């Protein structure tokens with residue numbers, strides 16, 4: 001069906017424009033095509049060795065738009081999706097190295113870590129639960145911090161790009177250098193991978209009830225440490241983990257600053273380009289209205305519509 | 321004294337935790353503390369009937385969407401939160417409504433649509449169109465601020481009614 005790869009050259013060139021005007025707009029219209037789009041862009045960009053450009057820039061514009069800082073990347077966007085996909089594609093081995101040992105431990109344990117007095121059973125000894133939890137954590141966090149350098153260079157560079165973006169935006173706010181990184185590597189990678197191990201195929205067994213609940217307590221502990229938050233003013237009953245938090249904060253900061261410090265950047269695509277065009281055609285109308293607005297993209301979005309129309313024509317002539 | 325198993329759902333950053341903490345602890349704090357899964361209990365009188373609230377505050381980041389099937393099967397009421405300054409948060413309400421209606425396999429399912437952050441000048445979402453979504457779901461719509469204590473007792477307390485009168 002689809003046209004030879006040559007047919008899309010002008011198209012590809014526009015997509016790959018540094019300003020990413022096309023991609024920005026597509027980030028607006030996709031809606032429920034969001035995964036599919038993300039999926040295609042990444043394949044294209046990776047094929048061009050320009051993933052960094054894609055993700056740094058697109059993450060950069062989302063920081064630009066934010067204004068409010070404790071909401072950044074907290075919702076779903078195309079940017080969040082790209083990152084999720086790029087991280088599955090390139091950071092699975094990192095997740096296995098850092099997490100597998102302790103996840104396996106937790107599965108095959110049979111002792112409870114339950115702290116909430118309401119969930120405790122008859123005769124169940126909260127003192128032991130806490131000791132079991134703190135130990136699991138101690139080990140896990142060791143393995144995490146010691147995979148600081150196993151994370152591939154390009155992802156780290158992208159985390160670097162994140163640090164420089166919130167720098168420019170919030171130069172005086174001295175928290176965001178690490179938080180912006182925490183949100184991807186913990187909230188959107190490690191903590192899920194602990195919660196749901198099947199995520200990165202660590203184990204494919206449904207946890208026992210307790211293992212299920214342990215992974216949750218653990219991830220809560222790790223996300224709190226990741227955020228630098230001591231328990232007590234939220235859930236009451238997690239006070240007993242604050243020593244773990246208090247003794248690991250400095251290491252969590254180091255880990256989150258270091259992780260981004262890399263400022264040196266380290267087949268036929270007609271299938272992918274065809275499909276991206278298909279999405280442009282589909283959101284053809286929403287694309288017009290975005291090129292009715294001024295600013296420096298308008299130029300480019302109008303060239304887009306041209307090519308979108310033009311390509312659809314060429315495909316009809318191909319049609320039988 | 322029965323006890324209702326409320327579940328607070330919606331997109332990341334919409335104020336699900338701020339709502340729960342305004343309810344449970346009766347103060348506010350702007351901060352960065354994304355949730356994985358927190359649980360709270362609070363005994364309260366509504367209508368003159370003293371009951372106990374069992375509130376599950378959730379993570380609304382995509383990579384936690386496997387968690388929901390669980391929290392939905394066991395939950396009795398669903399507080400579906402969006403941010404009145406964020407239209408994306410608003411469209412994400414559809415995901416939730418439609419899974420809740422499979423796992424429970426009912427179009428009637430106690431639920432309240434919440435328009436939080438109403439204290440802010442930058443509405444991208446008009447009561448009207450929220451009013452309507454809610455009216456079309458056959459559920460109440462309640463605007464809130466966790467910042468100001470506004471609409472909060474209202475929002476939890478309505479969802480309790482939804483379960484009783486269900």
Ligand SMILES: Nc1nc2c(ncn2[C@@H]2O[C@H](COP(=O)(O)OP(=O)(O)O)[C@@H](O)[C@H]2O)c(=O)[nH]1
Pocket residue numbers: 070071074331332333334335336337338339349350351352353354355380436437438439440464465466467468
């Ligand atoms: N202005 C305002 N900010 C709020 C309100 N509720 C929450 N926030 C802020 O929005 C962010 C997200 O709150 P949070 O409860 O953690 O979001 P969650 O992911 O839905 O739990 C924080 O910066 C909160 O202070 C509200 O009613 N008004």
Ligand SMILES: [Mg+2]
Pocket residue numbers: 336337338353354355377378
């Ligand atoms: Mg929360």
